[PDB]
Design a protein around this ligand. Structure first.
Ligand SMILES: O=S(=O)(O)CCNCc1cccc(O)c1
Length: 658
């Protein structure tokens, strides 16, 4: 339908603009819609963009406002002193500031719906909150309102929450427009969603993006399909992949590389209140940290991820056990039968389940899918679902059978409660994925296996060598295969660090020369160097000019195919901040052919220094553009947990970076 008020081209330079004369008398009915197209690339700490208020002395808590923070958060206040109502809804990390040097036109649609008693906020096509209340306070029904205001809120004759920005177009509707009509509002977005709430994954949250340009020109992406908030394991997580055959313009409905079925693929809205936000799915198996590589020889695509059995993760993973028993040179998967006190079982070749205590083979075997068969008949357990209907998290049997899996809670046979690493392969460049296979241990029978570094493996351009970086305490454990990932060996490389999330990524500077950038605990990104195509590694050094917080963040790195300023070019993707995960950057480095030193020459801010930027993925697209798929939020902060559609893709060209 049609607007009751329409204005635009408003400049908010720390002075409010009065539109009361024009707007107020047009207000009528108890449901309303706001449509605001605005820019803020130098926001103040906290500012109102728009406000209906009672400006009369002693009614300072009678106003509606649409406010933002310089961290990118958006919200409304709906306060009526005389109704004893002070509503406040918001979601951190909902905005854009700048892109390619230009102010982003952000599009905001707030719906106040008096029949459903529900407020709803959209920003650039993304629903960022939807709240129902017992008691609806219409924004036009606030007692004694007498001002409509832009760039401030007029309380008691003074300008509160003064804004620095601009509102290019604002519209108003004495109606609560439908979710469908919203979608027909044109957007001016500089980003895209690859995976997204409501897609085939049916996961509401995504984390840990990957990107990898296949040789056909297909660009591939994997990611954590995180169901139980954005928590790490323990939780439910699946690995999902999508691809683009058009240089990152469009992307395929995603499929699963790695998946478990003990728990329903549920789309939950995870509570963001302090009392509940640390609810955690606790009985589910899960995957986490995918990394991708393409093998030149067989043509196959290879994808690895950390694997976690039911209830298990970083903090409670049985260290001092690999989960395997080594009998005569070879490694065998340990199991525990229901009702035992110990792992009196192993999984030998062709799956056969052996009781160790009597050395006898049993009637059970283990299929490719790590499923249990008895007598060659596959057993089933019941699926679980979760809900917050009782008010806390509740995990309950949903009356649906699924094949029994040795990683599940209800399995007759259970793996060792620690962390593993699995691979899968695609023969069709991400249109399907084979059943995953466990990698063997590398650091011994009595050590929990390492941790996969999420991102890309390196395929060495002049050999058949495939390399996947992993980390554990004290060292980067590189995983080398020269036979299409059919067999693996480890190349260890000490680092001056204990208990670091030493997430490592590699570039090939020239044939056989691998430099690996990695996350530390010192606030500075580290690096090392191999010159035998990964056989041995240098001591550790650090980068100056880039800053990270003490706990640090994953860093993505690539070898640019083209020469820049006449020199070999490396590109780095990372937050540049000592305070949190924000101030995203692409940093371009030229190599010194004399000593292999890199001169960090160009810094490109992905968005404002105060806007969240976390885990990231970078690829060189077949048209030589650069694709960036990243966590556009502070995925460390406890205040920005459980946001939907914050992993975003952008397209960049080199000249944008310089
Ligand atoms: O905590 S973050 O730095 O945001 C991400 C860490 N992910 C590490 C990890 C790997 C495997 C299992 C986990 O529970 C956790």
């Amino acid at each position: 339908i049609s607007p009751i008020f329409q204005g635009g081209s408003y400049q908010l330079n720390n002075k409010s603009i009065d539109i009361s004369s024009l707007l107020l008398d047009k207000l009528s009915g108890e449901s309303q819609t706001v449509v605001m197209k605005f820019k803020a690339d130098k926001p103040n700490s906290l500012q109102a963009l728009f406000g209906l208020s009672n400006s009369k002395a002693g009614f300072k808590n009678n106003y509606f406002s649409i406010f933002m923070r310089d961290s990118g958060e958006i919200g409304v206040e709906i306060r009526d002193a005389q109704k004893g109502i002070n509503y406040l809804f918001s979601r951190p990390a909902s905005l854009w500031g700048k892109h390619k040097g230009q102010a982003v036109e952000n599009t905001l649609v707030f719906v106040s719906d008096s029949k459903d008693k529900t407020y709803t906020m959209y920003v650039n096509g993304i629903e960022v909150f939807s709240e129902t209340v017992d008691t609806f306070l219409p924004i036009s029904n606030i007692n004694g309102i007498d001002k409509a205001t832009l760039g401030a809120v007029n309380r008691e004759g003074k300008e509160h929450y003064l804004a620095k920005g601009s509102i290019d177009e604002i519209s108003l509707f004495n109606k609560a427009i439908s979710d469908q009509e919203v979608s027909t509002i044109p957007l001016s977005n500089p980003f895209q969603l690859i995976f997204q709430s409501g897609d085939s994954t049916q996961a509401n949250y995504f984390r840990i993006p990957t990107l990898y340009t296949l040789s056909s020109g297909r660009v591939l992406s994997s990611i954590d399909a995180r169901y139980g908030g954005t928590h790490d394991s323990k939780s439910k997580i699946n690995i999902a992949t999508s691809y683009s055959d058009d240089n990152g313009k469009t992307w395929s409905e995603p499929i699963f590389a790695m998946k478990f079925n003990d728990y329903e693929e549920q789309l939950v809205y995870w509570p963001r209140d302090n009392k509940l936000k640390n609810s955690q799915i606790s009985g589910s198996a899960s995957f986490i940290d995918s990394s991708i590589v393409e093998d030149k020889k067989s043509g196959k695509t290879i994808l690895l991820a950390d694997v976690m059995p039911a209830g298990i993760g970083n903090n409670n993973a049985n260290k001092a056990d690999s989960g395997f028993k080594e009998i005569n040179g070879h490694y065998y998967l340990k199991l525990k039968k229901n009702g035992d006190n110990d792992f009196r079982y192993t999984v030998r070749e062709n799956g056969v389940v052996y009781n160790e205590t009597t050395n006898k083979p049993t009637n059970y075997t283990i299929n490719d899918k790590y499923e249990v068969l008895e007598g060659g008949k596959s057993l089933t357990v019941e699926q679980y679902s979760v809900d917050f209907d009782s008010g806390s998290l509740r995990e309950r049997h949903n009356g649906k059978q699924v094949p029994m899996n040795v990683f599940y809670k209800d399995s007759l046979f259970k793996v060792t409660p620690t962390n593993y690493i699995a691979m899968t392969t695609s023969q069709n460049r991400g249109e399907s994925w084979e059943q995953f296979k466990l990698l063997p241990p590398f650091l011994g029978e009595k050590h929990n296996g390492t941790y996969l570094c999420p991102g890309q493996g390196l395929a060495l351009k002049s050999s058949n060598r495939l390399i996947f970086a992993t980390y554990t305490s004290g060292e980067l454990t590189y995983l080398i295969s020269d036979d299409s990932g059919q067999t693996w060996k480890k190349s260890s490389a000490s680092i001056p660090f204990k208990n670091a999330t030493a997430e490592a990524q590699m570039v090939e500077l020239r044939d056989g020369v691998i430099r690996t950038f990695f996350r530390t605990t010192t606030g500075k990104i580290a690096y090392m160097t191999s010159r035998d195509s990964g056989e041995t590694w240098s001591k550790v050094s650090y980068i100056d000019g880039i800053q990270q917080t003490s706990y640090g963040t994953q860093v993505s790195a690539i070898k640019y195919s083209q020469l820049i300023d006449g020199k070999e070019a490396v590109i780095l993707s990372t937050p540049n901040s000592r305070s949190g995960r924000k101030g995203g950057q692409l940093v371009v480095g030229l190599v010194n052919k004399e000593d292999d030193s890199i001169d960090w020459k160009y810094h490109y801010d992905i968005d404002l220094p105060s806007y969240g930027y976390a885990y990231s993925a970078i690829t060189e697209l077949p048209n030589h553009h650069i694709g960036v798929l990243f966590e556009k939020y502070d995925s460390w902060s406890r205040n920005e947990l459980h946001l939907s559609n914050v992993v975003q893709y952008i397209d960049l060209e080199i000249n944008d970076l310089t």
